[PDB]
PDB file of C-alpha atoms in Angstrom:
ATOM      1  CA  UNK A   1       0.000   0.000   0.000  1.00 19.45           C
ATOM      2  CA  UNK A   2       2.987   2.344   0.539  1.00 21.67           C
ATOM      3  CA  UNK A   3       6.142   3.001  -1.484  1.00 20.01           C
ATOM      4  CA  UNK A   4       8.244   6.105  -0.777  1.00 20.54           C
ATOM      5  CA  UNK A   5       5.778   9.013  -0.752  1.00 23.29           C
ATOM      6  CA  UNK A   6       2.963   7.075  -2.477  1.00 20.66           C
ATOM      7  CA  UNK A   7      -0.225   5.206  -1.568  1.00 20.97           C
ATOM      8  CA  UNK A   8      -1.358   2.467  -3.989  1.00 20.85           C
ATOM      9  CA  UNK A   9      -4.924   2.611  -5.347  1.00 19.75           C
ATOM     10  CA  UNK A  10      -5.471   0.173  -8.253  1.00 19.29           C
ATOM     11  CA  UNK A  11      -3.848  -1.459 -11.288  1.00 20.74           C
ATOM     12  CA  UNK A  12      -4.190  -0.279 -14.894  1.00 19.94           C
ATOM     13  CA  UNK A  13      -2.278  -0.463 -18.174  1.00 20.05           C
ATOM     14  CA  UNK A  14      -0.345   2.472 -19.668  1.00 20.69           C
ATOM     15  CA  UNK A  15       0.652   1.662 -23.252  1.00 21.14           C
ATOM     16  CA  UNK A  16       4.243   0.424 -23.572  1.00 21.98           C
ATOM     17  CA  UNK A  17       4.689   0.596 -19.749  1.00 20.08           C
ATOM     18  CA  UNK A  18       2.190  -2.315 -19.375  1.00 22.32           C
ATOM     19  CA  UNK A  19       0.621  -2.963 -15.965  1.00 21.04           C
ATOM     20  CA  UNK A  20       1.169  -0.006 -13.623  1.00 20.32           C
ATOM     21  CA  UNK A  21      -0.300   0.980 -10.264  1.00 23.33           C
ATOM     22  CA  UNK A  22      -2.178   4.265  -9.785  1.00 21.84           C
ATOM     23  CA  UNK A  23      -0.891   5.916  -6.613  1.00 24.42           C
ATOM     24  CA  UNK A  24      -1.511   9.156  -4.718  1.00 23.04           C
ATOM     25  CA  UNK A  25       1.316  11.275  -3.379  1.00 21.91           C
ATOM     26  CA  UNK A  26       1.028  11.083   0.368  1.00 21.69           C
ATOM     27  CA  UNK A  27       1.405  14.854   0.941  1.00 17.43           C
ATOM     28  CA  UNK A  28       0.243  16.603  -2.286  1.00 17.31           C
ATOM     29  CA  UNK A  29      -2.331  14.038  -3.424  1.00 16.75           C
ATOM     30  CA  UNK A  30      -0.860  14.053  -6.916  1.00 18.14           C
ATOM     31  CA  UNK A  31      -1.787  11.055  -9.073  1.00 15.26           C
ATOM     32  CA  UNK A  32       1.174   9.053 -10.305  1.00 13.24           C
ATOM     33  CA  UNK A  33       1.792   5.676 -11.954  1.00 15.37           C
ATOM     34  CA  UNK A  34       4.282   3.237 -10.424  1.00 13.99           C
ATOM     35  CA  UNK A  35       5.984   0.833 -12.825  1.00 12.49           C
ATOM     36  CA  UNK A  36       7.474  -1.935 -10.648  1.00 11.39           C
ATOM     37  CA  UNK A  37      10.324  -4.084 -12.038  1.00 11.46           C
ATOM     38  CA  UNK A  38      11.423  -7.124  -9.996  1.00 13.66           C
ATOM     39  CA  UNK A  51      16.696  -1.213 -17.587  1.00 13.08           C
ATOM     40  CA  UNK A  52      19.486   1.179 -16.518  1.00 13.28           C
ATOM     41  CA  UNK A  53      19.908   2.295 -20.142  1.00 11.54           C
ATOM     42  CA  UNK A  54      16.150   2.488 -20.862  1.00 11.17           C
ATOM     43  CA  UNK A  55      15.692   4.760 -17.815  1.00 12.78           C
ATOM     44  CA  UNK A  56      18.423   7.161 -19.009  1.00 13.47           C
ATOM     45  CA  UNK A  57      16.776   7.442 -22.432  1.00 14.04           C
ATOM     46  CA  UNK A  58      13.364   8.103 -20.839  1.00 14.63           C
ATOM     47  CA  UNK A  59      14.888  10.795 -18.543  1.00 16.42           C
ATOM     48  CA  UNK A  60      15.703  12.672 -21.768  1.00 17.90           C
ATOM     49  CA  UNK A  61      12.021  12.918 -22.792  1.00 20.09           C
ATOM     50  CA  UNK A  62      10.732  16.300 -21.631  1.00 18.53           C
ATOM     51  CA  UNK A  63       7.731  17.372 -23.700  1.00 15.87           C
ATOM     52  CA  UNK A  64       4.218  18.232 -22.442  1.00 14.77           C
ATOM     53  CA  UNK A  65       2.688  15.372 -24.518  1.00 12.73           C
ATOM     54  CA  UNK A  66       5.139  12.535 -23.883  1.00 13.79           C
ATOM     55  CA  UNK A  67       4.801  10.490 -20.649  1.00 16.86           C
ATOM     56  CA  UNK A  68       7.322  11.850 -18.135  1.00 14.94           C
ATOM     57  CA  UNK A  69       9.532  10.061 -15.597  1.00 15.24           C
ATOM     58  CA  UNK A  70       9.272  11.778 -12.182  1.00 13.41           C
ATOM     59  CA  UNK A  71      11.594   9.593 -10.100  1.00 16.04           C
ATOM     60  CA  UNK A  72      13.208   6.146  -9.706  1.00 18.28           C
ATOM     61  CA  UNK A  73      13.096   4.302  -6.335  1.00 21.38           C
ATOM     62  CA  UNK A  74      15.355   1.324  -5.470  1.00 23.19           C
ATOM     63  CA  UNK A  75      13.612  -1.195  -3.197  1.00 22.66           C
ATOM     64  CA  UNK A  76      16.859  -3.235  -2.971  1.00 23.45           C
ATOM     65  CA  UNK A  77      14.638  -6.048  -4.310  1.00 23.21           C
ATOM     66  CA  UNK A  78      12.734  -4.110  -6.997  1.00 23.71           C
ATOM     67  CA  UNK A  79      13.118  -0.970  -9.114  1.00 22.41           C
ATOM     68  CA  UNK A  80      10.089   1.315  -9.109  1.00 22.54           C
ATOM     69  CA  UNK A  81       9.656   3.936 -11.833  1.00 20.61           C
ATOM     70  CA  UNK A  82       7.452   6.865 -10.890  1.00 21.45           C
ATOM     71  CA  UNK A  83       5.890   8.013 -14.164  1.00 21.16           C
ATOM     72  CA  UNK A  84       3.108  10.357 -15.335  1.00 20.56           C
ATOM     73  CA  UNK A  85      -0.450   9.074 -14.865  1.00 21.75           C
ATOM     74  CA  UNK A  86      -2.825   8.775 -17.864  1.00 25.42           C
ATOM     75  CA  UNK A  87      -5.709   6.398 -17.319  1.00 27.17           C
ATOM     76  CA  UNK A  88      -7.369   6.502 -20.717  1.00 26.81           C
ATOM     77  CA  UNK A  89      -6.506   5.680 -24.296  1.00 26.07           C
ATOM     78  CA  UNK A  90      -7.155   8.223 -27.053  1.00 24.98           C
ATOM     79  CA  UNK A  91      -8.928   5.813 -29.424  1.00 26.24           C
ATOM     80  CA  UNK A  92     -11.203   4.616 -26.601  1.00 28.23           C
ATOM     81  CA  UNK A  93     -12.218   8.236 -25.942  1.00 25.26           C
ATOM     82  CA  UNK A  94     -12.810   8.735 -29.696  1.00 24.56           C
ATOM     83  CA  UNK A  95     -14.917   5.532 -29.916  1.00 22.87           C
ATOM     84  CA  UNK A  96     -16.910   6.018 -26.674  1.00 23.07           C
ATOM     85  CA  UNK A  97     -18.254   9.248 -28.133  1.00 27.01           C
ATOM     86  CA  UNK A  98     -20.115  10.249 -31.296  1.00 29.56           C
ATOM     87  CA  UNK A  99     -18.274  11.858 -34.235  1.00 28.87           C
ATOM     88  CA  UNK A 100     -16.140  14.612 -32.702  1.00 29.57           C
ATOM     89  CA  UNK A 101     -15.796  18.121 -34.119  1.00 30.66           C
ATOM     90  CA  UNK A 102     -12.937  19.099 -36.434  1.00 33.41           C
ATOM     91  CA  UNK A 103     -11.759  21.455 -33.662  1.00 35.20           C
ATOM     92  CA  UNK A 104     -11.528  18.628 -31.061  1.00 33.20           C
ATOM     93  CA  UNK A 105      -9.598  16.424 -33.485  1.00 33.65           C
ATOM     94  CA  UNK A 106      -7.236  19.286 -34.420  1.00 33.45           C
ATOM     95  CA  UNK A 107      -6.626  19.995 -30.719  1.00 33.17           C
ATOM     96  CA  UNK A 108      -5.398  16.394 -30.196  1.00 32.55           C
ATOM     97  CA  UNK A 109      -3.555  16.414 -33.561  1.00 31.77           C
ATOM     98  CA  UNK A 110      -1.591  19.566 -32.629  1.00 30.90           C
ATOM     99  CA  UNK A 111      -0.329  17.912 -29.429  1.00 32.22           C
ATOM    100  CA  UNK A 112       0.773  14.752 -31.288  1.00 32.01           C
ATOM    101  CA  UNK A 113       2.557  16.666 -34.085  1.00 34.49           C
ATOM    102  CA  UNK A 114       4.454  18.757 -31.502  1.00 35.64           C
ATOM    103  CA  UNK A 115       5.587  15.613 -29.645  1.00 32.12           C
ATOM    104  CA  UNK A 116       6.736  14.136 -32.978  1.00 33.81           C
ATOM    105  CA  UNK A 117       8.590  17.348 -33.934  1.00 38.19           C
ATOM    106  CA  UNK A 118      10.313  17.338 -30.523  1.00 41.73           C
ATOM    107  CA  UNK A 119      11.457  13.735 -31.081  1.00 41.11           C
ATOM    108  CA  UNK A 120      12.991  14.691 -34.473  1.00 41.20           C
ATOM    109  CA  UNK A 121      14.959  17.768 -33.217  1.00 40.12           C
ATOM    110  CA  UNK A 122      16.602  15.820 -30.408  1.00 39.97           C
ATOM    111  CA  UNK A 123      18.338  12.660 -31.580  1.00 39.37           C
ATOM    112  CA  UNK A 124      15.759  10.179 -30.340  1.00 40.76           C
ATOM    113  CA  UNK A 125      15.739   6.584 -31.650  1.00 44.79           C
ATOM    114  CA  UNK A 126      12.634   6.285 -33.799  1.00 44.27           C
ATOM    115  CA  UNK A 127       9.689   4.328 -32.396  1.00 42.51           C
ATOM    116  CA  UNK A 128       6.804   3.377 -34.643  1.00 42.03           C
ATOM    117  CA  UNK A 129       3.799   5.261 -33.283  1.00 39.65           C
ATOM    118  CA  UNK A 130       1.298   2.682 -32.030  1.00 40.75           C
ATOM    119  CA  UNK A 131      -2.405   3.530 -31.458  1.00 45.63           C
ATOM    120  CA  UNK A 132      -2.153   1.962 -27.929  1.00 49.24           C
ATOM    121  CA  UNK A 133       0.674   4.363 -26.947  1.00 49.88           C
ATOM    122  CA  UNK A 134      -1.558   7.386 -27.441  1.00 48.33           C
ATOM    123  CA  UNK A 135      -2.905   7.892 -23.921  1.00 49.35           C
ATOM    124  CA  UNK A 136      -5.102  10.640 -22.484  1.00 49.57           C
ATOM    125  CA  UNK A 137      -4.867  12.206 -19.054  1.00 49.23           C
ATOM    126  CA  UNK A 138      -7.536  13.983 -16.995  1.00 47.49           C
ATOM    127  CA  UNK A 139      -6.855  17.389 -18.675  1.00 46.66           C
ATOM    128  CA  UNK A 140      -7.800  15.624 -21.948  1.00 47.17           C
ATOM    129  CA  UNK A 141      -4.183  16.026 -23.008  1.00 46.81           C
ATOM    130  CA  UNK A 142      -2.499  13.450 -25.221  1.00 45.53           C
ATOM    131  CA  UNK A 143       0.342  11.663 -23.454  1.00 43.53           C
ATOM    132  CA  UNK A 144       2.530   9.473 -25.672  1.00 43.55           C
ATOM    133  CA  UNK A 145       3.966   6.412 -23.906  1.00 43.41           C
ATOM    134  CA  UNK A 146       7.487   6.024 -25.331  1.00 46.40           C
ATOM    135  CA  UNK A 147       9.289   3.072 -23.763  1.00 44.03           C
ATOM    136  CA  UNK A 148      10.788  -0.166 -25.058  1.00 42.56           C
ATOM    137  CA  UNK A 149      11.609  -3.217 -22.947  1.00 42.94           C
ATOM    138  CA  UNK A 157       2.424  -8.258 -24.687  1.00 41.14           C
ATOM    139  CA  UNK A 158       5.314  -9.576 -26.839  1.00 39.49           C
ATOM    140  CA  UNK A 159       3.818 -13.020 -27.583  1.00 38.27           C
ATOM    141  CA  UNK A 160       1.061 -11.382 -29.642  1.00 36.02           C
ATOM    142  CA  UNK A 161       3.053  -9.119 -32.032  1.00 36.90           C
ATOM    143  CA  UNK A 162       6.576  -7.694 -32.369  1.00 35.26           C
ATOM    144  CA  UNK A 163       5.835  -4.888 -34.849  1.00 35.11           C
ATOM    145  CA  UNK A 164       3.571  -1.901 -35.466  1.00 33.99           C
ATOM    146  CA  UNK A 165       0.006  -2.205 -36.685  1.00 33.11           C
ATOM    147  CA  UNK A 166       0.160  -3.018 -40.440  1.00 33.65           C
ATOM    148  CA  UNK A 167      -2.627  -0.442 -40.873  1.00 36.41           C
ATOM    149  CA  UNK A 168      -0.289   2.406 -39.822  1.00 41.84           C
ATOM    150  CA  UNK A 169       2.778   1.229 -41.812  1.00 40.53           C
ATOM    151  CA  UNK A 170       4.110   3.459 -44.611  1.00 38.54           C
ATOM    152  CA  UNK A 171       4.484   2.258 -48.271  1.00 39.10           C
ATOM    153  CA  UNK A 172       8.293   2.505 -48.068  1.00 40.42           C
ATOM    154  CA  UNK A 173       8.386   0.221 -45.007  1.00 38.35           C
ATOM    155  CA  UNK A 174       5.800  -2.267 -46.348  1.00 38.10           C
ATOM    156  CA  UNK A 175       7.575  -2.565 -49.703  1.00 42.40           C
ATOM    157  CA  UNK A 176      10.987  -2.631 -47.973  1.00 41.15           C
ATOM    158  CA  UNK A 177      11.916  -1.848 -51.597  1.00 40.35           C
ATOM    159  CA  UNK A 178      12.668   1.691 -50.406  1.00 42.61           C
ATOM    160  CA  UNK A 179      14.624   2.856 -47.347  1.00 41.83           C
ATOM    161  CA  UNK A 180      12.936   4.844 -44.521  1.00 42.08           C
ATOM    162  CA  UNK A 181      13.404   7.976 -42.303  1.00 40.88           C
ATOM    163  CA  UNK A 182      11.433  10.622 -40.239  1.00 41.20           C
ATOM    164  CA  UNK A 183       8.826  10.829 -43.033  1.00 42.08           C
ATOM    165  CA  UNK A 184       7.351   7.526 -41.842  1.00 38.19           C
ATOM    166  CA  UNK A 185       5.984   9.469 -38.809  1.00 40.08           C
ATOM    167  CA  UNK A 186       4.173  11.811 -41.151  1.00 40.28           C
ATOM    168  CA  UNK A 187       2.424   8.774 -42.708  1.00 38.35           C
ATOM    169  CA  UNK A 188       1.528   7.402 -39.239  1.00 38.96           C
ATOM    170  CA  UNK A 189       0.256  10.825 -38.102  1.00 40.58           C
ATOM    171  CA  UNK A 190      -1.790  11.048 -41.316  1.00 39.89           C
ATOM    172  CA  UNK A 191      -3.556   7.791 -40.483  1.00 41.42           C
ATOM    173  CA  UNK A 192      -4.122   8.968 -36.901  1.00 41.31           C
ATOM    174  CA  UNK A 193      -5.581  12.283 -38.207  1.00 38.33           C
ATOM    175  CA  UNK A 194      -7.851  10.331 -40.607  1.00 37.32           C
ATOM    176  CA  UNK A 195      -9.024   8.021 -37.785  1.00 33.33           C
ATOM    177  CA  UNK A 196      -9.787  10.959 -35.473  1.00 34.15           C
ATOM    178  CA  UNK A 197     -11.831  12.841 -38.107  1.00 33.23           C
ATOM    179  CA  UNK A 198     -13.562   9.916 -39.828  1.00 35.10           C
ATOM    180  CA  UNK A 199     -13.820   7.341 -36.999  1.00 37.59           C
ATOM    181  CA  UNK A 200     -12.464   4.682 -39.369  1.00 39.40           C
ATOM    182  CA  UNK A 201      -9.150   3.493 -40.824  1.00 39.68           C
ATOM    183  CA  UNK A 202      -8.165   4.857 -44.301  1.00 37.74           C
ATOM    184  CA  UNK A 203      -6.714   1.448 -45.223  1.00 40.46           C
ATOM    185  CA  UNK A 204      -9.196  -1.063 -43.945  1.00 41.83           C
ATOM    186  CA  UNK A 205      -8.810  -4.531 -45.460  1.00 39.42           C
ATOM    187  CA  UNK A 206      -9.058  -7.767 -43.457  1.00 37.89           C
ATOM    188  CA  UNK A 207      -6.506  -9.627 -45.582  1.00 36.70           C
ATOM    189  CA  UNK A 208      -2.813  -8.557 -45.049  1.00 37.98           C
ATOM    190  CA  UNK A 209      -1.637  -8.790 -48.720  1.00 36.06           C
ATOM    191  CA  UNK A 210      -4.736  -6.794 -49.801  1.00 37.16           C
ATOM    192  CA  UNK A 211      -4.125  -4.150 -47.138  1.00 40.72           C
ATOM    193  CA  UNK A 212      -0.477  -3.789 -48.239  1.00 36.91           C
ATOM    194  CA  UNK A 213      -1.498  -3.409 -51.897  1.00 40.62           C
ATOM    195  CA  UNK A 214      -3.845  -0.483 -51.068  1.00 42.28           C
ATOM    196  CA  UNK A 215      -1.212   1.152 -48.835  1.00 40.33           C
ATOM    197  CA  UNK A 216       1.528   0.845 -51.500  1.00 40.44           C
ATOM    198  CA  UNK A 217      -0.753   2.384 -54.148  1.00 38.44           C
ATOM    199  CA  UNK A 218      -2.272   5.104 -51.905  1.00 40.38           C
ATOM    200  CA  UNK A 219      -5.871   3.928 -52.422  1.00 41.93           C
ATOM    201  CA  UNK A 220      -8.346   5.440 -49.895  1.00 43.97           C
ATOM    202  CA  UNK A 221     -11.493   7.596 -49.819  1.00 42.71           C
ATOM    203  CA  UNK A 222     -11.697  11.105 -48.378  1.00 43.02           C
ATOM    204  CA  UNK A 223     -15.208  11.652 -46.954  1.00 42.61           C
ATOM    205  CA  UNK A 224     -17.032  14.721 -48.326  1.00 42.02           C
ATOM    206  CA  UNK A 225     -18.051  15.860 -44.823  1.00 43.32           C
ATOM    207  CA  UNK A 226     -14.391  16.882 -44.329  1.00 41.87           C
ATOM    208  CA  UNK A 227     -13.399  20.537 -44.688  1.00 43.36           C
ATOM    209  CA  UNK A 228     -11.058  21.529 -47.555  1.00 43.74           C
ATOM    210  CA  UNK A 229      -8.376  22.268 -44.927  1.00 42.12           C
ATOM    211  CA  UNK A 230      -8.574  18.848 -43.228  1.00 40.68           C
ATOM    212  CA  UNK A 231      -8.907  16.895 -46.505  1.00 39.49           C
ATOM    213  CA  UNK A 232      -5.988  18.862 -48.021  1.00 38.37           C
ATOM    214  CA  UNK A 233      -3.629  18.234 -45.075  1.00 37.13           C
ATOM    215  CA  UNK A 234      -4.425  14.466 -44.955  1.00 35.93           C
ATOM    216  CA  UNK A 235      -3.913  14.226 -48.737  1.00 37.92           C
ATOM    217  CA  UNK A 236      -0.381  15.694 -48.391  1.00 35.22           C
ATOM    218  CA  UNK A 237       0.484  13.399 -45.500  1.00 34.94           C
ATOM    219  CA  UNK A 238      -0.668  10.219 -47.284  1.00 35.94           C
ATOM    220  CA  UNK A 239       1.693  10.503 -50.261  1.00 36.94           C
ATOM    221  CA  UNK A 240       3.307   7.226 -51.345  1.00 38.44           C
ATOM    222  CA  UNK A 241       6.686   8.707 -52.365  1.00 34.30           C
ATOM    223  CA  UNK A 242       8.189   9.826 -48.983  1.00 34.90           C
ATOM    224  CA  UNK A 243      10.401  12.451 -50.696  1.00 35.10           C
ATOM    225  CA  UNK A 244       7.163  14.192 -51.820  1.00 34.48           C
ATOM    226  CA  UNK A 245       5.419  13.847 -48.450  1.00 32.76           C
ATOM    227  CA  UNK A 246       4.827  17.044 -46.454  1.00 35.12           C
ATOM    228  CA  UNK A 247       7.350  17.415 -43.589  1.00 36.93           C
ATOM    229  CA  UNK A 248       6.479  17.771 -39.873  1.00 37.49           C
ATOM    230  CA  UNK A 249       7.709  21.397 -39.913  1.00 40.28           C
ATOM    231  CA  UNK A 250       5.428  22.332 -42.851  1.00 38.73           C
ATOM    232  CA  UNK A 251       2.449  20.622 -41.164  1.00 40.87           C
ATOM    233  CA  UNK A 252       3.022  23.068 -38.288  1.00 42.45           C
ATOM    234  CA  UNK A 253       2.604  26.070 -40.664  1.00 43.55           C
ATOM    235  CA  UNK A 254      -0.461  24.705 -42.415  1.00 41.72           C
ATOM    236  CA  UNK A 255      -3.473  27.084 -42.476  1.00 41.46           C
ATOM    237  CA  UNK A 256      -5.833  24.435 -41.077  1.00 41.56           C
ATOM    238  CA  UNK A 257      -3.303  23.116 -38.500  1.00 43.25           C
ATOM    239  CA  UNK A 258      -2.533  26.617 -37.146  1.00 43.12           C
ATOM    240  CA  UNK A 259      -6.106  27.490 -36.128  1.00 41.66           C
ATOM    241  CA  UNK A 260      -6.280  28.126 -32.350  1.00 40.27           C
ATOM    242  CA  UNK A 261      -2.792  26.647 -31.967  1.00 42.18           C
ATOM    243  CA  UNK A 262      -1.330  27.186 -28.501  1.00 39.93           C
ATOM    244  CA  UNK A 263       2.133  28.753 -28.665  1.00 38.35           C
ATOM    245  CA  UNK A 264       3.737  26.241 -26.217  1.00 40.66           C
ATOM    246  CA  UNK A 265       3.386  23.549 -28.931  1.00 42.07           C
ATOM    247  CA  UNK A 266       5.652  25.373 -31.445  1.00 42.40           C
ATOM    248  CA  UNK A 267       9.346  24.518 -32.003  1.00 42.29           C
ATOM    249  CA  UNK A 268      11.813  27.233 -30.884  1.00 41.00           C
ATOM    250  CA  UNK A 269      12.309  28.594 -34.427  1.00 41.29           C
ATOM    251  CA  UNK A 270       8.554  29.214 -34.868  1.00 42.04           C
ATOM    252  CA  UNK A 271       7.844  30.740 -31.439  1.00 43.09           C
TER     253      UNK A 271
END
């Protein structure tokens, strides 16, 4: 029930952190997640991640028996929240999308080993802020990203890859958030990969020109023609009601 300054409440999952325990700080009442391991290198890399929309490490406690990571609490998943509601407004989707794009841009500027964005790593906290779980140590089910989010250049292997794969991922996420369905949908793997490689998908007509236009430039098969993260951040549609704290230093 007690560990350092924390009082254990219940167990939940937090994306790539797996099973964690919700705990309350014993003086401030702050909610926290405790990841108990019964690693050195993975902690150091996580300590480097300081963005408002990436899950933060607060502290590490040594139980001389177990290592306990004290990480940011986020008890919901973004896609759950999207599903458990009716079609959300373009402005709600953009709000979430801005937070994600900023976290991605941050990852690019610092030299952070690329992690395929997984739908299950997109968590939501109580402020309805996106919190990306970025951690890498379950694994008997799948060892790779969702095929539905994989870029043509990865799928074909025929090309090499870079930071433009994140633009493709983010383009699928943006499509999912606006349309409540996957752009590339197929039940059969080889069929799904054929549609992805050829860029075959439908843009619903209920979309605004701004939203449809941005998606269309993110879901470009040739990665050298794909819009960059930095240009996404200057897009007319993207920029609407954009909080300043999300901008990279050069755009502030």
